[PDB]
Design a protein around this ligand. Sequence first.
Ligand SMILES: N#Cc1ccc(COC[C@H]2O[C@@H](n3c(NCc4ccc5ncccc5c4)nc4c(N)ncnc43)[C@H](O)[C@@H]2O)cc1
Lengths: 377, 111
Amino acid sequence: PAVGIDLGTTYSCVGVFQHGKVEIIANDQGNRTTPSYVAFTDTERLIGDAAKNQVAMNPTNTVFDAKRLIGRRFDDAVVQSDMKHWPFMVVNDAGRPKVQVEYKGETKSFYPEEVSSMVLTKMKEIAEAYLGKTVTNAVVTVPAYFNDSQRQATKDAGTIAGLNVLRIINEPTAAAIAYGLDKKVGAERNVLIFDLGGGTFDVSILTIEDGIFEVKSTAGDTHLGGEDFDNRMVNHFIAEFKRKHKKDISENKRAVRRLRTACERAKRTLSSSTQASIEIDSLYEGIDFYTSITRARFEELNADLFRGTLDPVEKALRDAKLDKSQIHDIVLVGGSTRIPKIQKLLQDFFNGKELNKSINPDEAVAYGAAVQAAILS
Amino acid sequence: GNSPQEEVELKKLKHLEKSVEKIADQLEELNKELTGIQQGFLPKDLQAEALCKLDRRVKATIEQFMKILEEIDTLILPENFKDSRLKRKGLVKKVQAFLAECDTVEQNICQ
Ligand SMILES: N#Cc1ccc(COC[C@H]2O[C@@H](n3c(NCc4ccc5ncccc5c4)nc4c(N)ncnc43)[C@H](O)[C@@H]2O)cc1
C-alpha cells in the first residue's frame, strides 16, 4: 500500500488509492486534513489537531509554517520576513534556521525538516490507523518553486519519518494528475494551476505532452489567503458596532476573536448561500451583536484583493511566453478557490473557459499524489 | 406556541451548560490548590514553579470557556425562541463572569 501526502504549510492531507478509488484519510479527530503543527509543553509533544487546539495557551512553543523554513539558509530574505508573522522563535545555527522552544525543563531547537518529519509521522500513522496495516511507501508533494535544498530536506523529513519516498512530485503536477489531465489524447496542453488557500497563493503553468509534465512558470503571493478576507469582514463589523453602539471593541482580544471566528464561518456560508447571519450575545460591555452580511457586500469588501489574484496569473503567462487563449486547462486548488467571485474572475479572464474544480480543493494535491503513489508501488 | 424545533436548541444549550459546569469545577480546583501553595509551605523558587503550573491550567480553562463561547456563537435563535434566547444569554453572561474569575487568578501569579 502506498499513500499520497500533501505536506502543506498550514494543513497536511493523506490519501490512498484502494479498490480503484482515492480515499482521503481522516485523522483520529475525524478530519480529512491535519494542522501542520507541533507543540512543546510541560509534559508532552503534540502533533496536529492537539497542537493547534492549544495554540492560544502556548503560542511561543507551538511551531507551524516549517515548510517556509525547510531547505533554506537563515539569511534567506523569505526566512527573515516570515519570522515577523511567527510568535515562536527562529534561530541561526551555522547558517541554517532552527526553531527554538522549551520542551519542558530543557530549551530545545529543531531544524525545519525535523518538525516536517514529525508532521509526516502523524500522516503516516493516520494512514496506518485507517488501513490497519504498516505504511512505508509514499509520494510527498512540494511546491513547483522549491529548490534542490528544499526538495531534498523534504525528502529527508520523509526518510526520518520512516517513509520510503518513492518520488517528490510538484503540487500543481499532482493536482493535474488528480483530474486525469496527463491521460489526454493528442497535442501538448498548457495547464494553469491556480492555488489559493488560507495563507499562500501559488500560480503555476505546466506543459503536459504524452503524459509527460514540464513546469513553465510560477507566480503568486506568499502571504495571501482567506485569512485576509476574514479581516476585511472583521474591520467592517468593528466599524458597524462603533456606528450602532458608539463603542470600540478592537482592544478586547476575546471579542475580536469571537467576531473573527464568526466571520470566517460566515465567509464559508457565503460560498454556498448569498447571505450569512451572525448572532453574538454579550460581545462587548454586555452588548449583543446581531448582524448579517450578503455575498455581494463580502465581495465588495474584498474587491481589490480578489481582482489582485489575476496579476500573478498574468505574470505567470508572461514568464511562460503564453497567451491566455493558449491555456487548455485551469485547475482550482486551496480552500479559498471555493469563493464564487474568485471562480468568476478567473472564469472571465480566460473568456469563459471552464474550471477543473470537482475535487475538494483542499484535497486535490493529496488525491493526485495518491494516484501517483499507487502507480509507483 | 412551543415548537418541536426549539427542543433541538434547548438540548444543545443544556449540553453546553454541563460543559461550562465541568470547566467551572476545574476553575474551583485552581483556587483550592492556589491557596495551599500561596502559603509558604515550600521555598520561594519552587513555590513559583508551582504557581506557573497553576497558571498554565488557568490558561487551559480560559481557552475552554472561549471554545464554549465560539460554539454558542454559531446559534441563530428566532425571536419567538424566547426560552432558547434567555438560556443562551444566561450561559454567555455566566461564562464571562467565570472568565473574569480566571483573569483575577492569572494576574496575581507566575508573572
Ligand atoms: N477542519 C478543518 C479545516 C480544513 C481545511 C482548512 C483549509 O482552508 C484554508 C482556507 O480555505 C478557506 N475556506 C474553506 N476551507 C475549508 C474548510 C472546511 C471546513 C471548516 N470547518 C471549520 C473551520 C474551517 C473550515 C474550513 N472553505 C471555504 C469556503 N467554503 N468558502 C471560502 N473559503 C473557504 C478557509 O477559511 C481557510 O482560510 C481549514 C480548516
